[PDB]
Design a protein around this ligand. Structure first.
Ligand SMILES: *[C@@H]1O[C@H](CO)[C@@H](O[C@@H]2O[C@H](CO)[C@@H](O[C@@H]3O[C@H](CO[C@H]4O[C@H](CO)[C@@H](O)[C@H](O[C@H]5O[C@H](CO)[C@@H](O)[C@H](O)[C@@H]5O)[C@@H]4O)[C@@H](O)[C@H](O[C@H]4O[C@H](CO)[C@@H](O)[C@H](O)[C@@H]4O)[C@@H]3O)[C@H](O)[C@H]2NC(C)=O)[C@H](O)[C@H]1NC(C)=O
Ligand SMILES: *[C@@H]1O[C@H](CO)[C@@H](O[C@@H]2O[C@H](CO)[C@@H](O)[C@H](O)[C@H]2NC(C)=O)[C@H](O)[C@H]1NC(C)=O
Length: 391
């Protein structure tokens, strides 16, 4: 009565017939009753193409209970060109996606160039939330995304828990969870196996808390890349605690582009265990993957970044603070860092600091003796206070 099973609205659940129409119809029914649940039942597999579940004409507090499997079409005709997301939830209040079922993007057809006369640089995000207040994602697994697994854009009050991504470590650009223009988020008790950043925090994000997460494979937990194409980025109050990273290319990273502007401030990375991680601790203001590697006079201002209790083994550079000549990093603090080289090659690479100011609160392994204790008039002279933040 209160639970709208998609099979009662025309869905075939055979994996082969297109059930998109049926899902839209079930959504329209669920949208009319509060406390309603749209159930995608266990024991069935549903082929669903691009779809947008709109909240504008819908109700608030809806539950989308995914217990079976939703699979993406592999035919190019299902997608058209320029589509940035497969499944979208837009303008919802209090939406919950829960259950122990699976979203499978069949991403290998995209990674592997089987769509269209031509591969798009940016492929669809599997599950995207836009413009929503009070979003919960729990329980589900997203596997084999065409690109990003889960995205939050312009959302507030987000909770992600008991959540899993699974795409191959060598799949291109398959980041786990991406946030942009989103605030007041908690991501916890989740397992992220990705081909790119496990968690990527982009501009406009603040008050993000990540804890009790396992990453690997993937590229680590990253703020950025910020400021590409001479743009302004603002990120503040990011906490990452109690995370284990296995065979990722970075551990905890902040990356920004030369020519960017704005500010990344008040970041805490604590209780991080790394196992065979290439670059465990990195601030890179020379980031240029996918573009030009020239220098420019503007930078994103990085300040008040704290690293506490980070231990394990590394395979490339243990610590790299590569900050802009035009705007040094400041307020970097390190405590209780115990990193051991996993390979001989790694053992020959010492910490690297460039234009980085801060303090060592304890001795570290390897020793970090390149952080500058003096203040930076250069950093203080660039206006990166009121352009980004009101407090
Ligand atoms: C874009 O812009 C970037 C940033 O400028 C360019 O990349 C930089 O290129 C330069 C030149 O090739 C590199 O410089 C070398 O840096 C090393 C490393 O320095 C660091 O490590 C030292 C310990 O190994 C440490 O002492 C250094 O700190 C001191 O020096 C800095 C620099 O003045 C100073 O700020 C500190 O207070 C310290 O005094 C630093 O942490 C350094 O060893 C090299 O110097 C040796 O060689 C030079 C000349 O060859 C010699 O004169 C010196 O006395 C010394 O013997 C040298 O400075 C730098 O590493 C690059 N930085 C990054 C982040 O990559 C890049 O090329 C530009 N790109 C383009 C396309 O333009
Ligand atoms: C910095 O971010 C943290 C985490 O987002 C904020 O603390 C949370 O604030 C919410 C209110 O929105 C509380 O319900 C949570 O209990 C807080 N979480 C934790 C772990 O404490 C904090 O408010 C932010 N700081 C500022 C000044 O905004």
């Amino acid at each position: 009565s209160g639970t709208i099973n998609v099979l009662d609205h025309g869905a075939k659940g055979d994996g082969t017939s297109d059930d998109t129409k049926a899902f839209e119809d079930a959504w329209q029914v669920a949208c009319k009753v509060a406390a309603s649940t749209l159930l995608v039942p266990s024991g069935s597999t549903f082929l669903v193409g691009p779809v947008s579940f709109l909240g504008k004409e819908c109700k608030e507090k809806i539950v989308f209970q995914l217990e079976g499997k939703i699979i993406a079409p592999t035919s190019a005709s299902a997608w058209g060109s320029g589509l940035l997301q497969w499944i979208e939830f837009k303008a919802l209040q209090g939406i919950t996606i829960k259950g122990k079922g699976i979203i499978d993007g069949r991403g290998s057809v995209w990674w592997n160039d089987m769509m269209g006369t031509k591969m798009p640089r940016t492929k669809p995000t599997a599950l995207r939330f836009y413009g929503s207040n009070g979003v919960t994602v729990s329980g589900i697994t997203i596997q084999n995304s065409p690109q990003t697994h889960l995205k939050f854009d312009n959302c507030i009050s987000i909770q992600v828990s008991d959540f899993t991504t699974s795409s191959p470590g060598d799949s291109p650009n398959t980041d786990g969870i991406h946030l942009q223009n989103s605030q007041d988020a908690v991501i916890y008790r989740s397992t992220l196996a990705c081909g790119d950043d496990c968690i990527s925090i982009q501009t406009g994000c603040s008050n993000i808390n990540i804890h009790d997460v396992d990453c690997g494979p993937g590229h680590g937990i990253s703020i950025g890349g910020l400021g590409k194409d001479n743009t302004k980025a603002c990120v503040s109050n990011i906490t990452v605690r109690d995370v284990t990273m296995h065979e990722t290319t970075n551990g905890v990273r902040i990356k920004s582009w030369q020519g960017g502007s704005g500010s990344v401030k008040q970041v805490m990375f604590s209780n991080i265990q790394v196992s065979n991680v290439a670059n465990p601790i990195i601030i890179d203001q020379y980031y240029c993957d996918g573009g030009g590697c020239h220098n420019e006079t503007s930078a994103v201002a990085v300040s008040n970044i704290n690293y506490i209790n980070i231990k394990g083994t590394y395979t490339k550079e243990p610590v790299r603070f590569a900050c802009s000549d035009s705007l040094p990093c400041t307020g970097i603090s390190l405590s209780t860092i115990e990193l051991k080289p996993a390979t001989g090659k790694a053992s020959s690479l010492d910490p690297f600091c460039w234009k980085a100011h801060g303090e060592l609160k304890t001795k570290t392994l390897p020793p970090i003796q390149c952080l500058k204790t003096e203040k930076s008039p250069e950093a203080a002279s660039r206006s990166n206070n009121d352009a980004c933040f009101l407090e």
